[PDB]
Design a binder for this molecule. Structure first.
Ligand SMILES: *[C@@H]1O[C@H](CO)[C@@H](O[C@@H]2O[C@H](CO)[C@@H](O[C@@H]3O[C@H](CO[C@H]4O[C@H](CO)[C@@H](O)[C@H](O)[C@@H]4O)[C@@H](O)[C@H](O[C@H]4O[C@H](CO)[C@@H](O)[C@H](O)[C@@H]4O)[C@@H]3O)[C@H](O)[C@H]2NC(C)=O)[C@H](O)[C@H]1NC(C)=O
Ligand SMILES: *[C@@H]1O[C@H](CO)[C@@H](O[C@@H]2O[C@H](CO)[C@@H](O[C@@H]3O[C@H](CO[C@H]4O[C@H](CO)[C@@H](O)[C@H](O)[C@@H]4O)[C@@H](O)[C@H](O[C@H]4O[C@H](CO)[C@@H](O)[C@H](O)[C@@H]4O)[C@@H]3O)[C@H](O)[C@H]2NC(C)=O)[C@H](O)[C@H]1NC(C)=O
Ligand SMILES: *[C@@H]1O[C@H](CO)[C@@H](O[C@@H]2O[C@H](CO)[C@@H](O[C@@H]3O[C@H](CO[C@H]4O[C@H](CO)[C@@H](O)[C@H](O)[C@@H]4O)[C@@H](O)[C@H](O[C@H]4O[C@H](CO)[C@@H](O)[C@H](O)[C@@H]4O)[C@@H]3O)[C@H](O)[C@H]2NC(C)=O)[C@H](O)[C@H]1NC(C)=O
Ligand SMILES: CC(=O)N[C@@H]1[C@@H](O[C@H]2O[C@@H](C)[C@@H](O)[C@@H](O)[C@@H]2O)[C@H](O[C@@H]2O[C@H](CO)[C@H](O)[C@H](O[C@]3(C(=O)O)C[C@H](O)[C@@H](NC(C)=O)[C@H]([C@H](O)[C@H](O)CO)O3)[C@H]2O)[C@@H](CO)O[C@H]1O
Ligand SMILES: CC(=O)N[C@@H]1[C@@H](O[C@H]2O[C@@H](C)[C@@H](O)[C@@H](O)[C@@H]2O)[C@H](O[C@@H]2O[C@H](CO)[C@H](O)[C@H](O[C@]3(C(=O)O)C[C@H](O)[C@@H](NC(C)=O)[C@H]([C@H](O)[C@H](O)CO)O3)[C@H]2O)[C@@H](CO)O[C@H]1O
Ligand SMILES: CC(=O)N[C@@H]1[C@@H](O[C@H]2O[C@@H](C)[C@@H](O)[C@@H](O)[C@@H]2O)[C@H](O[C@@H]2O[C@H](CO)[C@H](O)[C@H](O[C@]3(C(=O)O)C[C@H](O)[C@@H](NC(C)=O)[C@H]([C@H](O)[C@H](O)CO)O3)[C@H]2O)[C@@H](CO)O[C@H]1O
Ligand SMILES: *[C@@H]1O[C@H](CO)[C@@H](O[C@@H]2O[C@H](CO)[C@@H](O[C@@H]3O[C@H](CO)[C@@H](O)[C@H](O)[C@@H]3O)[C@H](O)[C@H]2NC(C)=O)[C@H](O)[C@H]1NC(C)=O
Ligand SMILES: *[C@@H]1O[C@H](CO)[C@@H](O[C@@H]2O[C@H](CO)[C@@H](O[C@@H]3O[C@H](CO)[C@@H](O)[C@H](O)[C@@H]3O)[C@H](O)[C@H]2NC(C)=O)[C@H](O)[C@H]1NC(C)=O
Ligand SMILES: *[C@@H]1O[C@H](CO)[C@@H](O[C@@H]2O[C@H](CO)[C@@H](O[C@@H]3O[C@H](CO)[C@@H](O)[C@H](O)[C@@H]3O)[C@H](O)[C@H]2NC(C)=O)[C@H](O)[C@H]1NC(C)=O
Ligand SMILES: *[C@@H]1O[C@H](CO)[C@@H](O[C@@H]2O[C@H](CO)[C@@H](O)[C@H](O)[C@H]2NC(C)=O)[C@H](O)[C@H]1NC(C)=O
Ligand SMILES: *[C@@H]1O[C@H](CO)[C@@H](O[C@@H]2O[C@H](CO)[C@@H](O)[C@H](O)[C@H]2NC(C)=O)[C@H](O)[C@H]1NC(C)=O
Ligand code: NAG
Ligand code: NAG
Ligand code: NAG
Lengths: 175, 319, 319, 175, 319, 175
C-alpha cells in the first residue's frame, strides 16, 4: 500500500473482527475490549460497491450481426469478416485486462487510505496526551476507562481535561 | 496499570484469494469476484426470446417451401436455430449470393407468405418433380411456380404486379437450367430462354445454361434462385420467353430484432437473455469466454477464461 | 490572547457541480467542463472546406451529364452534398455496383471532363431521347454518345485510345437494352449485340438483354453503365457489333481529401472544420454525439450525450 | 479523498477566498487575517490544465470513409459495414467513460494531496513550538504578529528564536 | 557534538530523461525505456519462418505454371514474398475475383500439384502459344490443358472426377476468348461455346466473348480463370461444347499459418519472429511504428514513433 | 508527488548513492556515514519490474490477414478494408498513449510513497527522543554511535533506553 498502514505499520489483520472492516482494540482499567468503526468501514464499502458500473455500461441488447464461422473457403470478404471480429476481440481483451488491474490497484489503495485516515483521526484527537507506539498503537498517559475509550471512538474526547494528569505520568522521568 | 493503550486495526479472513494489480502479479485480498462467464447452461432457453428450432430444415428451405419444411410455413421467430443434420429434399438448386439472402430473411424474422394473383397466359403452371416428394407424390417448392410450355407454345410472358401497400415486398423467383437441348426445347419451345425481372429503378436478366450436372435425387438439371425488392409505389415486372420459375406472391420484409444461429445444442424450458451456439449463458458478468457468436443481452466476448476483481482490502493473516 | 492560532484551508464556490469518479457515482467539485458536443449549428458552413450543394442533382447524375445537372459540369469540391428532393431526369438507367462508382467519383472530387476524338466509322452518333429533354428538345447524357445503325449497317466497331498522359484515366461507358427484337434490329442491325471494353490487363464483355421494363418518362428500354480504369502507358479498346453507348473522353482521377454526404440541412455563411448531416459542428471538445457520419476535423462519435470532466477540487460548502 | 484533508480533517471550504485555491486564516495580536498560498494553488492548476491533452491526440482530419446509413436491404456487405461502425462506436464509448472516471479520480486525489502537502509543510516548520488542533489548525505557543505569520507563509520562520518562549507558555501546566 | 543527526534520501543520476505522466507533459526520471519499435533490420530473415522469394514471379503465376515460374513448381512456404520487377510471361489472362484466389492460395501455403487422369475424348489436347515460350518453343501454363477441335469435331465434353480423398480439392480451370468468329469456329467447331463446371452443391457456367483486345506478346485473344472447390464425397463435373481450358488435376487446400507479402527488401541470413515490407523487425517491445503490414509474432502497430516508460523515480539533481 | 517527499520536503537526490534507491546519511560521534536501505529499494523495484506485463498480453502470433495497400481504385470493399484498419490503428494508438501516462503516473507516485513510508517508519521508531527537522532529517537528542545508528536501520532501536538522556538534552532549555 502507498500509505504503509495495512501490511506495514499495522502488523496484520484481525480475524476476530466479524464486526466491521476497521476498528480498535484497547486495554484499560476495566480490562480489554474491541469495537468496529462503522464510518471507516462504510466509506470503503461505498467506494467498492458498484465499482465496475462506473466504467462499464449496463450490458446492451444486440441482435443480428456478421457471421463468425465458415464452411467454405471464400477469400477476400471472409478475410475481412474474420479480421473485423479478431480485431474486436483483441481490443476488448485488452480493455478487460487493464480495467481489472486499474480497479484492483485503486481498491488496494483506498482501503490502505481508510486505515491511515482513521489512525490519523485518532492521533489528532489525543494530542500530546498520547504516544505513537509505531505499530498503530497509542500509549495513553492517563487512567482511561470504557466511557473514556468510547469517547475517543465517538470523537467527543477532550484532552484539556486530561492534560495535567497526562503530563504528570509522562514527565515523571529524567535521570 | 493506571494508564491505557489503544490500538487500531483492520480485519482479515481465513479464506483469502489472489488478485492482480498494477503493482503486483498476485496479491491476497479479503474477497474477489469473477468477471468472466465461462460456464454455459448446456441448453437454449425457450424464454425469454422466441426460439424456432429448424430441426431438419435450413432457413432458406423453410422459406422456399421444401416439402419437409411445410411446418415452418406460418412461422416467425426472434432466433431461428439451424441444426447440422439439416438437409434439403426438394429440386436441386443454388442461390448466387446465398449468405445475403439467408441474412435478409433471418433479420426479417418470418417466412410468412402472401400469395398474389399472377397471370401466366398460355403456359402450364405447377411443374412438379420426382426429386421433391410431398407425401409420396411429385411436387415442387411451395412458394415457386414452375412454368412450362402449353401445347406447342411458350409466348413471351409479360406480367405486371404493382406495390400498392406501404412497405417493401420481397419477391423470390428463379430460373431452370435444363440438362440437354433436347430437354430445353421440350419444356420451353425456344432454344434459348431468359428472364428479365425489373422495376422502375433496377433490373436483372438471367440466361439459362444448358448441360449435365451430377445427379441429385435422380435429377441432373438445376435451378438458380434470385430475389427482388419492390419499393412502395414502385412496380414489379417479369419478362420471359423461357425457363422462368415464377413467384407466387411476396414476403413482407421487416425491420426487427430477428436472427439465425447455427447450433446443435438442445432447446429446453428455462429463462435467459443471452444465447450462444453452446447454449444460453448467464447475464450478470461483464465479460464472457463461452463463444464469440452471441444473440441478445450478452457480456462482451474476450480471450481470457478468468478475471478476478478485488472487493475487499489486502488480506494479512496472523504473523 | 498573547499567543496565535493559524488555520489552513481551501476554497469553495456557491455553484458547485456533480461529476463521476472511480470512487463515486456523483460527487461535487468547484468546476467541470463538458467533453461531448451535442449541439449542432443547424447549418453547413461554406467555409472552410469547399462545399458543393447538389440541389436537384445526385453526384452520379452530375458526372454522367443529366440535362438538369449541366451546371455542375465544371465543378470540383471538398464535400458534395446530396439532397433528397434529388431526382433523375434523363434516360432510365442502372449502374451495377453503383455505390462503388459513387465512392470513386466522390473521393476524386471533380466531374470535370476531358473530351477525346473517338472515331465511330459507319454509324450514326448522338442518339437522343424524349425522356431526356435539354431545354425542351430530345437529348441524352452529355458525357455519353449513343451510337446506332447508319443506313443498313452497324459494322464491328474496333476503336482504340492509348493513355499517354502520366495519370489514370477513368472512362464511363454503357450498353443499351432494347424492349423488343423489333426495336433491337431496327437500331442495331445484328440480332444480338455486345461490348468488349479491354486493356492490356483487364477486360469486360457485356451482352444486352431484350425485353420490356416499366415505363420511365415514356421509355421501356434501359441503359446499364460501366467503368474502366486505364493506367498510364496502357491502352483502352472498345469492340462492339451492337448496343454500345460510347464514352466521349475521360475523367481525371484524383487522390484527395474529397467526399460526398447525404444531408437536407441548408448551407450558410459561417466558418467551421467539421460537417455532419445535421450541420457543421464545433471542433473544440474531444467527443461528439451529433452524428456518426462526419467529414473533416471532427471529435470522435460516442453514444453518451454528456460527459463531465472535473477541473477543480472537491466542493465542500459551509457545514 | 485518500489523504483525509479536504472534506475530512479540514471541516469545509472557504467561499471568502476569491484569491487562490489554498491558503491560511490566522488570529493574532494584530487581529485576524487571510492569505492565499500561491505555490500550492499553482501546483494543482498546472496538473489540471491541459490534463486531457496528455492522453487524447489533438483531433485529426478525416475525409472519405464508409457509408453508415442505407436505403436498400443488401445483406452480407451492409451487415459488415454496420458491424464495423457499431464496433468502433462501442469501443470509443468505453474509452471515453473510463477516461473521465480516471481523470476525475486523479484530480480529486491530487487536490487533496496539495492541501495535505501544505498543512504538513507548515507543521514541519513550527516543530514543538505548536500544536496540531485536529481541524487543520495550529495552536502557536507564542506572541506572533503579522510579520511573524508572514514569515511562516514565506518559509523563513525560525523556531529556535521562539523555542524558549513557547516552552514557557506550553509548560505553565501540571497539577 | 554529543548528539546525532540522521537524514533520509533517495538517489539521483547524472543522465536523467524526460517522460510523460497524467500530471505533467515532461518530467525527469532516473530511467526510461522505449516502448515503440521504429528501426527495422533492413532485410528479411530467412529464419525462423520459411520464406520463399518470388523473384520474377507472382504467386498466381507460380501456381498456374507460367514457364519462367517452373522453379516454384514443388514449393511450399510460411511467407511468399512478391517483388515488383515481378511480371507475367505466358498467355494473357485475367482472373475475375483475382485477390480472393491470391488469398486462398497464399494461406494454403503451397503450389504443389497432384495430376489426375482426365479423359477428353475426340479433341486435341496441349494447345500451345507463341506468347508463352518454354525455353524457346511455344508452350502454355503447365497446370492448364488447352483443348481444341480434333479433325472436324468438338463434341460435348462430359467428364467426371469424384473426390474420394478426405480433404477439399481445389481445381483451377479457364475459358478462352477468341478474337474473331473466324478464329472461334476454326479452333472450336461450334459458333458459340460454353463451360459448365458443377458439383452436387454448386455450379458455374461461363460463356466466351468474341472480339479483339490489345496485343500482349503478339496475341489479341485472352483467357479467363476460374476455380472450384470440391468437398470430400462430392464430385467434379465439366460440361463443354467449346472454349474450355481444362484442369490437369488438383491443388491440396490447407489450413495453415501461411501467407503472402509485397516487399522489395532483400532476404538475408539472420533470425527473427516478425516480418514487414521494410524488413524483419525486433520482437521485444509492445508497440511498433515500422509498418501496419505484418506477419508473425509482432508488436502492435501505432501512429507514434516514440513512447517512453518510466522505470525509475523522479530525478532531482543537486539544487 | 502526492506525498510531497521526493522533490518536496527532501530537498534533492543523492548521486553519491551508487548503492540503492533509498537510504540514510548520518553525522555522529564516529564521523559521517551513508547506508542504502534495501527493503525500500526492493519494494519499489519489484513494482516497477514487469510492470507492463500486467496489462499487455505476451505478444501473439498472427498470420494471414487483410490487404492494407492497394494498386487499383475499387470503391466499396476497399473503402471498408481501409476503414477497418484505420479504426484499428487509431484505437491502439489511444491505448498506448493512455497506458504510458497511467503507468508513469503510478510509478512516480509509488516511489514517492516508498520514500515517505521509510521516513515515517524511522520517525515512529524514534518517538519523542527526536525532532522532525523538516528536510527529512531527524535531530537525535542523545549520543548515538554507529552501532546506535545501525540499530535504527535494522529496526531494533530501543527508545526507552535513551528516554532519560534525550529528555535532559531536550529540556535543558527555557528562559
Ligand atoms: C455425363 O457423365 C456422367 C457421369 O459419367 C453421367 O451421369 C451418370 O449417368 C448415369 C446414367 O446414365 C447414372 O447412372 C445411374 O446412377 C444412379 C445413382 O446410383 C447411385 O446411388 C445408388 C444407390 O441407389 C448406388 O448404386 C451408387 O452408389 C450410385 O452412387 C442409379 O440409381 C441408376 O440405376 C439404374 O440403372 C441401373 C444400371 O443401368 C439399373 O440396372 C437399375 O435398375 C437402375 O434403374 C443409374 O445407374 C450415374 O449415376 C450418373 N452419374 C452422375 C455423377 O451424375 C451423365 O449421364 C453424362 N451426361 C451425358 C452423357 O450427357
Ligand atoms: C407489358 O405489360 C406492361 C403493363 O401491362 C405494358 O406496359 C404498359 O403499356 C401501356 C401501353 O401499352 C402503358 O399505357 C400508357 O401509360 C402511360 C403512363 O400513364 C401513367 O401516367 C399518367 C399521367 O400522365 C396516368 O394516367 C397514370 O397514372 C399512369 O401511371 C400513359 O401516359 C399513356 O397514355 C396514352 O394512351 C392513352 C390510352 O390509349 C391515350 O388515350 C392517351 O392520349 C395517351 O396518349 C398510355 O396509356 C402503360 O403505362 C404501361 N405500363 C407500364 C407499367 O409500363 C407493356 O406494354 C407490356 N409489354 C408488351 C406487351 O410487350
Ligand atoms: C482493332 O484495332 C487495333 C488497333 O488499331 C488493332 O490492333 C493492332 O493490329 C496491328 C496489326 O494489324 C498491330 O501492328 C503490329 O504491331 C506489333 C507491335 O508493335 C509494338 O512493339 C514494337 C516493338 O517490337 C514497336 O514497333 C511499337 O512500339 C509497338 O508498340 C508489331 O510488332 C507488328 O510489326 C509487324 O508489322 C510490320 C508492319 O506491317 C512489319 O513491317 C514488321 O515486319 C512486323 O512483322 C505489327 O505492326 C498493332 O500493334 C495492334 N495494336 C494493338 C493496340 O493491339 C486490331 O488489329 C484491330 N482489330 C480488328 C481490325 O479486327
Ligand atoms: C433408364 C432410362 O432411360 N429410364 C427413363 C428415365 O430416364 C431417366 O431417369 C431419371 C430418374 C433421370 O435420372 C435421368 O437421368 C434418366 O435418364 C425417364 O425419366 C425422366 O427423364 C427425364 C429427362 O431425361 C427427366 O429426368 C424426368 O424427370 C422429371 C422429374 O423431375 O422427376 C419428371 C418431371 O415431371 C419433369 N418436370 C417438368 C417437366 O416440369 C422433370 C423436368 O423435366 C426435369 O427435371 C428438368 O431438368 O423431369 C424423368 O422422369 C423416364 C421418363 O421419360 O423414362 C424412363 O424409361
Ligand atoms: C400509341 C402509339 O403507339 N404511339 C406511337 C408511339 O408509341 C410509343 O410511345 C412512346 C412514348 C412509348 O411509350 C412506347 O411504349 C409507345 O408504344 C411511338 O413512340 C416511339 O416508340 C418507340 C418504340 O416503340 C420508342 O419508344 C420511341 O422512343 C424514342 C425516345 O427515346 O423518345 C425516340 C428516340 O429518338 C429513339 N432514340 C434513338 C433511336 O436513338 C428512342 C429509342 O429508340 C428507344 O428509347 C430505345 O429503347 O425512342 C418513341 O418515340 C411513335 C413513333 O414511332 O409513334 C406513335 O404513333
Ligand atoms: C502479317 C500477318 O498477317 N502474319 C501472319 C500472322 O498474323 C498474326 O501474327 C500474330 C503474331 C498476331 O499478332 C496476329 O494478330 C497477326 O495477324 C499469323 O500468326 C498467327 O495468327 C493467328 C490468328 O490471327 C494467331 O494469332 C496465331 O497465334 C498462335 C499463338 O498463340 O502463337 C498459334 C498457336 O499455335 C495457336 N494455339 C492454338 C490453336 O492452340 C494460337 C491461338 O489460336 C490463338 O492465340 C487464340 O487466340 O495462335 C498466330 O501464330 C501467321 C500464321 O497464321 O501467318 C502470318 O503470315
Ligand atoms: C464477497 O463477494 C462475493 C462476490 O462478489 C459475494 O458473493 C456475491 O454477493 C453478491 C452481492 O450480495 C450476491 O448477489 C446476491 O444474489 C442473490 C441471488 O442471486 C440475491 O438474492 C441477492 O439479493 C444479491 O443480489 C451474489 O449472488 C454473490 N456472488 C456469487 C458468485 O455467488 C460473497 O458473499 C462476498 N463474501 C464476503 C465474505 O463478504
Ligand atoms: C471553469 O471551467 C470552465 C470550462 O472548463 C470555464 O469556462 C471555459 O474557460 C476556458 C479557459 O479559459 C475558455 O477558453 C477561452 O475561450 C475564449 C473565447 O472562446 C478565449 O478568448 C480565451 O482565450 C480562452 O481560450 C472557455 O471559453 C470556457 N468554456 C466554455 C464552455 O464557455 C470557466 O470559466 C471556469 N470557471 C471558473 C469559476 O474558473
Ligand atoms: C534502465 O532501463 C534500461 C531499459 O529499460 C536498461 O537497459 C535494459 O536493461 C534490460 C534489463 O536488464 C536489458 O535486458 C537484458 O538484455 C541482455 C541482452 O539482450 C540480456 O543478456 C540480459 O539477460 C537482459 O535480458 C536490456 O537489454 C536493456 N535495454 C536496452 C534497450 O538496451 C538500463 O540498463 C537501465 N539503466 C540503469 C542505470 O539501471
Ligand atoms: C428428421 O428426419 C428423419 C428422417 O430422415 C426423421 O426421423 C426418421 O423417422 C422416420 C419415420 O418417420 C424413419 O425413417 C426413422 O425412424 C427416422 N430416421 C432417423 C435417422 O432417425 C425425423 O422425424 C425428422 N424430423 C422431423 C421433425 O421431421
Ligand atoms: C429543382 O426542381 C424544381 C423543378 O422540379 C425547380 O423549382 C420549380 O421551378 C419551376 C419553374 O422553373 C416551377 O415548375 C415551380 O415553380 C418549381 N417547383 C417546385 C416544386 O417548387 C427548382 O428550380 C429546381 N432547382 C434548381 C436549382 O434547378
Ligand atoms: C462452444 O462451441 C464451440 C464450437 O462452436 C467449441 O469449439 C467450444 O469448445 C465450446 N465452448 C465451450 C466453452 O464449451
Ligand atoms: C441528426 O440527424 C439524424 C438523421 O440523420 C437524426 O436521426 C438525429 O435526430 C439528428 N441528431 C441531432 C443531435 O440533432
Ligand atoms: C516502410 O515502407 C513503406 C512503404 O511500404 C514506406 O512508406 C516507409 O517509409 C517505410 N517505413 C520505415 C519506418 O522505414
Amino acid at each position: 500500500g502507498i500509505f504503509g498502514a495495512i501490511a506495514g505499520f499495522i502488523e496484520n489483520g484481525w480475524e476476530g473482527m466479524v464486526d466491521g472492516w476497521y476498528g480498535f482494540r484497547y486495554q484499560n482499567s476495566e480490562g480489554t475490549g474491541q469495537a468496529a468503526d462503522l464510518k471507516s468501514t462504510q466509506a470503503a464499502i461505498d467506494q467498492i460497491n458498484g465499482k465496475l458500473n462506473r466504467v462499464i455500461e449496463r450490458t446492451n441488447e444486440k441482435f443480428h450481426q456478421i457471421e463468425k464461422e465458415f464452411s467454405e473457403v471464400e477469400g477476400r470478404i471472409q478475410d475481412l469478416e474474420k479480421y473485423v471480429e479478431d480485431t474486436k476481440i483483441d481490443l476488448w481483451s485488452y480493455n478487460a485486462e487493464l480495467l481489472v488491474a486499474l480497479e484492483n490497484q485503486h481498491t488496494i489503495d483506498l482501503t490502505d487510505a481508510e486505515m491511515n485516515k482513521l489512525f490519523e483521526k485518532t492521533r489528532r484527537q489525543l494530542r500530546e496526551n498520547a504516544e505513537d507506539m509505531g505499530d498503530g498503537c497509542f500509549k495513553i498517559y492517563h487512567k482511561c476507562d470504557n466511557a473514556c475509550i468510547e469517547s475517543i471512538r465517538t470523537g467527543t474526547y477532550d484532552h484539556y481535561i486530561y492534560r495535567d494528569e497526562a503530563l504528570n505520568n509522562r514527565f515523571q522521568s529524567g535521570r | 496499570n493506571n494508564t491505557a493503550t489503544l490500538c487500531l486495526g483492520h480485519h482479515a479472513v481465513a479464506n483469502g484469494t489472489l488478485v492482480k494489480t498494477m503493482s503486483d502479479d498476485q496479491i491476497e485480498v479479503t474477497n474477489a469476484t469473477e468477471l468472466v462467464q465461462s460456464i454455459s447452461m448446456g441448453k437454449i432457453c425457450n424464454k425469454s426470446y422466441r426460439i424456432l428450432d429448424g430441426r431438419n430444415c435450413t432457413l432458406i428451405d423453410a422459406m422456399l417451401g421444401d416439402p419437409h419444411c411445410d411446418a415452418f410455413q406460418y412461422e416467425s421467430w426472434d432466433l431461428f436455430i439451424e441444426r447440422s443434420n439439416a438437409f434439403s429434399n426438394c429440386y436441386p438448386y443454388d442461390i448466387p449470393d446465398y449468405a445475403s439472402l439467408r441474412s435478409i430473411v433471418a433479420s426479417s424474422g418470418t417466412v410468412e407468405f402472401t400469395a398474389e394473383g399472377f397471370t401466366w397466359t398460355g403456359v402450364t403452371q405447377n411443374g412438379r418433380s420426382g426429386a421433391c416428394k410431398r407425401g409420396s407424390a411429385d411436387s415442387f417448392f411451395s412458394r415457386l411456380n414452375w412454368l412450362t410450355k402449353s401445347g406447342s407454345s411458350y409466348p413471351t410472358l409479360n406480367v405486371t404486379m404493382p406495390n400498392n401497400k406501404n412497405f417493401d415486398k420481397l419477391y423470390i423467383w428463379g430460373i431452370h437450367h435444363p440438362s440437354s437441348n433436347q430437354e430445353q426445347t421440350k419444356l420451353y419451345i425456344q432454344e434459348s430462354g431468359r428472364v428479365t425481372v425489373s422495376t422502375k429503378r433496377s433490373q436483372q436478366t438471367i440466361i439459362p445454361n444448358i448441360g449435365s450436372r451430377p445427379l441429385v435425387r435422380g435429377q441432373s438439371g438445376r435451378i438458380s434462385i434470385y430475389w427482388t425488392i419492390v419499393k412502395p409505389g414502385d412496380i414489379l415486372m417479369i419478362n420471359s420467353n423461357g425457363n422462368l420459375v415464377a413467384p407466387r406472391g411476396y414476403f413482407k420484409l421487416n425491420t426487427g430484432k430477428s436472427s439465425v444461429m447455427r447450433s446443435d445444442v438442445p432447446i429446453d424450458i428455462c429463462v435467459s437473455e443471452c444465447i450462444t451456439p453452446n447454449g444460453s449463458i448467464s447475464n450478470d458478468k461483464p465479460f464472457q469466454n463461452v463463444n464469440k457468436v452471441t444473440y441478445g443481452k450478452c457480456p462482451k466476448y474476450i480471450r481470457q477464461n478468468t478475471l478476478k476483481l478485488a472487493t475487499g482490502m489486502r488480506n494479512v493473516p496472523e504473523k
